[PDB]
Design a protein around this ligand. Structure first.
Ligand code: IM2
Length: 262
């Protein structure tokens, strides 16, 4: 453990940024923490809490995931990998949730936010599940500024690890909703060079990445090591320069360091 600690600290010092790690081993509830209580900009990883809020509604509102929303050229933002393929057409909340989680579509994120009534409702949802750290303040793309010292749109590695666990393995969501979130996370197409890169290839993973200003490179995941109890891992990383380049490789190394031998 203290060896895992020295390695993480060395990884951070060599990277020149600020690293935040929180790993929860559901086998014995043990934890590997590094700046786990410090706040980091979540940017794209905040889409998990947001999608989960929509899923929560579906527990009481029958067929809500089949409800349609119109996509218009005016809704488009700086990143619409999927939504731009539907200009002038409709997308269901499920499709929007999938586009948001698996391709990190910014316009889909804003569609979900509009449906939920704004980011304050996502924050409220987080509080309803016991997360008092999480906070969503803005919409896309402003929530990605990741300004140092700014608390807007941030959370701690540990708090996000606990909520991801509650949402994917716990009781924060009901069975069908819990299963849909896990499926969406496993279908993510943007995490190939992050947490997944530092893990044995056959291990099963569900995750949500994030890449924003100040070279902030994030990733939150649920890991199933073969037939052993799943691990919940959060690797957050931010740098001194506003225009810094992303370090998906730092998250891969943090991942390997804390999960090796698990
Ligand atoms: C989330 O933090 C941002 C924001 C614009 O919504 C998006 C952008 C990306 S693509 C980053 C790196 N890909 C290729 N070079 C992601 C993402 O999931 O990676 N989130």
């Amino acid at each position: 453990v203290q060896q895992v600690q020295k390695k993480l600290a060395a990884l951070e010092k060599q990277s020149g940024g600020r690293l935040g790690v929180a790993l929860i081993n559901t086998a014995d509830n043990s934890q590997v923490l590094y700046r786990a209580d410090e706040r980091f900009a979540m940017c794209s990883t905040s889409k998990v809490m947001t999608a989960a809020a929509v899923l929560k509604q579906s527990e009481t509102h029958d067929g809500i995931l089949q409800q349609k929303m119109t996509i218009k050229k005016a809704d488009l933002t700086n990143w619409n990998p999927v939504t731009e393929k539907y200009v002038g057409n409709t997308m269901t909340l499920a499709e929007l949730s999938a586009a948001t989680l698996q391709y990190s579509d910014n316009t889909a994120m804003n569609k979900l936010l509009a449906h939920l009534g704004g980011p304050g409702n996502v924050t409220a949802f987080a509080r309803s599940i016991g997360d008092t750290t999480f906070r969503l303040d803005r919409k896309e793309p402003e929530l990605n500024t990741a300004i140092p010292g700014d608390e807007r749109d941030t959370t701690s590695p540990l708090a996000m690890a606990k909520s991801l666990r509650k949402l994917t393995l716990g009781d924060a969501l009901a069975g069908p909703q819990r299963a849909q979130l896990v499926d969406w996370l496993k279908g993510n197409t943007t995490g190939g060079q992050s947490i997944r890169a530092g893990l044995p290839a056959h291990w099963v993973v569900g995750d949500k990445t994030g890449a924003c200003d100040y070279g902030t490179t994030n990733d939150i995941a649920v890991i199933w090591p073969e037939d052993r109890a799943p691990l919940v891992l959060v690797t957050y990383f931010t740098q001194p320069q506003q225009d810094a380049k992303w370090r998906k490789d730092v998250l891969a190394a943090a991942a390997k360091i804390v999960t090796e031998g698990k």
